[PDB]
Amino acid sequence: ASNFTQFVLVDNGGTGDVTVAPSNFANGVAEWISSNSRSQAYKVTCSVRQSSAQNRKYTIKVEVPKVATQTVGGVELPVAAWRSYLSMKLTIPIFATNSDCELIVKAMQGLLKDGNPIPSAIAANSGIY
Amino acid sequence: ASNFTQFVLVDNGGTGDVTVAPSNFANGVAEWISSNSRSQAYKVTCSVRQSSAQNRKYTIKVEVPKVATQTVGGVELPVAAWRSYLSMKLTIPIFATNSDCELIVKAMQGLLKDGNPIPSAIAANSGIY
Amino acid sequence: ASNFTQFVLVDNGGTGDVTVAPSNFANGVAEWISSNSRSQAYKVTCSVRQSSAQNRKYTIKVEVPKVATQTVGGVELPVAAWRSYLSMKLTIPIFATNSDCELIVKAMQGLLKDGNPIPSAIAANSGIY
Amino acid sequence: ASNFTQFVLVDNGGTGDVTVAPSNFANGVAEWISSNSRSQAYKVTCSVRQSSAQNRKYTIKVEVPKVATQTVGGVELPVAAWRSYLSMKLTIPIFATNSDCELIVKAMQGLLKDGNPIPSAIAANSGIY
Amino acid sequence: ASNFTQFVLVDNGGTGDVTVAPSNFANGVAEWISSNSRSQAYKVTCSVRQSSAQNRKYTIKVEVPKVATQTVGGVELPVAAWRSYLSMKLTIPIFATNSDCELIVKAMQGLLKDGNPIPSAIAANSGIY
Amino acid sequence: ASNFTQFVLVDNGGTGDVTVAPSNFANGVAEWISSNSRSQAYKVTCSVRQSSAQNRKYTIKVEVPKVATQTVGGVELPVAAWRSYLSMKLTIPIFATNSDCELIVKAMQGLLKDGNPIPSAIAANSGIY
RNA sequence: GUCUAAGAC
RNA sequence: GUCUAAGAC
Numbered sequence A, B, C, D, E, F: 001a002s003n004f005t006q007f008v009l010v011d012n013g014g015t016g017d018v019t020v021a022p023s024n025f026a027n028g029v030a031e032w033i034s035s036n037s038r039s040q041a042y043k044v045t046c047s048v049r050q051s052s053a054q055n056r057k058y059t060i061k062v063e064v065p066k067v068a069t070q071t072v073g074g075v076e077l078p079v080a081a082w083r084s085y086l087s088m089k090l091t092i093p094i095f096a097t098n099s100d101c102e103l104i105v106k107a108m109q110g111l112l113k114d115g116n117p118i119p120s121a122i123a124a125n126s127g128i129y
Numbered sequence G, H: 001g002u003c004u005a006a007g008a009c
Helices: A098-112 A117-123 B098-112 B117-123 C098-111 C117-122 D098-112 D117-123 E098-112 E117-123 F098-111 F117-122
Strands: A007-010 A018-024 A030-034 A043-049 A055-072 A075-093 B007-010 B018-024 B030-034 B043-049 B055-072 B075-093 C007-010 C018-024 C030-033 C043-049 C055-065 C083-093 D007-010 D018-024 D030-033 D043-049 D055-072 D075-093 E007-010 E018-024 E030-033 E043-049 E055-072 E075-093 F007-010 F018-024 F030-033 F043-049 F055-065 F083-093
Touching: A007 A030, A007 B098, A043 B117, A055 B098, A055 E075, A075 A098, A075 B098, A075 E075, A098 A117, A098 B007, A098 B055, A098 B075, A098 B098, A098 B117, A117 B043, A117 B098, B007 B030, B018 C043, B075 B098, B075 D055, B075 D075, B098 B117, C007 D098, C043 D117, C055 D098, C055 D117, C083 C098, C083 D098, C098 D007, C098 D055, C098 D075, C098 D098, C098 D117, C117 D043, C117 D098, D075 D098, D098 D117, E007 F098, E043 F117, E055 F098, E075 E098, E075 F098, E098 E117, E098 F007, E098 F055, E098 F083, E098 F098, E098 F117, E117 F043, E117 F055, E117 F098, F083 F098
Parallel strands: none
Antiparallel strands: A007 A018, A018 A030, A030 A043, A043 A055, A055 A075, A075 B075, B007 B018, B018 B030, B030 B043, B043 B055, B055 B075, C007 C018, C018 C030, C030 C043, C043 C055, C055 C083, C083 D075, D007 D018, D018 D030, D030 D043, D043 D055, D055 D075, E007 E018, E018 E030, E030 E043, E043 E055, E055 E075, E075 F083, F007 F018, F018 F030, F030 F043, F043 F055, F055 F083
């Protein structure tokens, strides 16, 4: 059994599909990277630690690169023009049962479901109004 | 036009559906709260600010309460035994077009899609392995 | 659903009713204005926030114009002589359930009901006696 | 006659009706309370004062209690779990006619009428949107 | 209804039309932007505040960008060569009727109508003479 | 050719149009006034200068009289209660070609076009909502 | 503006 | 009043 495997990060039907694969798991930090130049790859990292007596804290991080070619002195390199950085911290008390957790996951999914306020605002360079 | 409206945070088919509604929008912070006792409600807040010359930063926060009744001195009150706290920060360079943004949203959705590593780990009081 | 719709403030059985419609929503402070010059209009504003860690607080303000010997569309000074100001503040503990709130609303309705000492005193330029 | 009479504050259709009665006028503040122990009674107070040289100001307060029985020192006492507080201040110019004042009363009644936005929001534990 | 809707800012007869849409209302400032990267978008903002005791003041701003692609560090980024800035402040007395306000709108429209002196001068890079 | 000619500021389809004609040109500041007492007239002024080394700046000012309950030719005080003031400032970089300027004009026309959120809000003594 | 509410900060 | 523009001098 293992959940440290590759998965589809960006789903574009069956074409542009961005897949991210296990890269490293040093120091309690699982890391996934998409293929090709590390310089233009997507990155996802995750780690759980016992943040206190009653809480466990998850720290998920995602990097979305803007793929581009950099030319300097006539030498070109695959780079990322810039990167968008996602960073989330989820705290869960140790009293939470598996059902409680499933619910927390559903809340996260609903928050980002297509059509709801937050994803729509983000997807359009907008805020709330 | 408005995206500051109510939406379904937790989708339980058509039954246990947790809906969250606009509560307040003071100081650039949009806030949504589910119904009934504020003390046991779900809360979602969001805000975007220009974090620097080239970046806009979104700050989404979600609270999932563990509903319970507190009895003290024979007086009972609707409370939350505890709360799970989600907190995310998303940074997006001003060069990102609407397409770039749609992609960032899809990455967030894929990250939490059912069956993928992170949501499965969370939903089971587990980490990565 | 969406409660920021126009409603009837002063009801005179259809003929000569005073309808007030949404006119502003800056900072989450909902505002309703009648179809008049801002100086002679009926204004209603409402907003909610968590005043303390234990209570939420609704703040409602109403402005009613003096109609006797009024000159529609004219410049009437001093403004203090032609306008009445109503300022309501409802503090509700966070333990109040939807039902508890329905009761609180019913109480406010009874307070101002036709025939009761309070409204009948105001309508007669009187106090209690 | 005398307008300092008892009236029904919460109408639950003849049964469960919270009625309130005159209970004090000391210091120019008319008070009404329900038939309970002072510790868990509904309370309504009213006072008018000539605030400015050209204004009169009514100050009205209502207290809605959440009745509970509490065990203090092994002994049960009738008490209030919490109280909701309505506080209104109405400023009317002296130039206002009785007809002008009736308008103010009708506006306050329409404001709280069943189905209109504000009472709807309050009863649903939400804001206006 | 809601007047916070998208509208076409630059009409190039159905094709090449710059349309602008709601994108933010944080802090009482309504914002609209075109569908570009924040770095090269058209932007329109509006806010009303009760400046004096007898005035209301609208503050409107429009930003027209000269889109260009710039090579920074050997990488191409969508940027604006320069921006043109329109800034208008309108002060209306509270005694103004809706009919009085329509007059203000009609005057602003006539001011900028095709062929009239001012737009003619601006479009020709000249002064009035 | 010579743009300092009289034009129509407020158009009501011929019947009751408000034409404004040149009335002053001191210091290159072109001025247009309607056929009224300077206190009740419609005034328009315009001037251009190089605000900085990079931009030129048009400064337009419009004054619109309050007509409701107005007394043609009378002395109406306070002046602040009977006049609305519009103050436009257009900053245009020195790189803007005639075309670039034609676009900027088109944008201003769209902003104030009939039916769009901005003019329709002003004409209704409203803000955005 | 707040609250523990005709009196408190 | 200026600008590099809801925030700067």
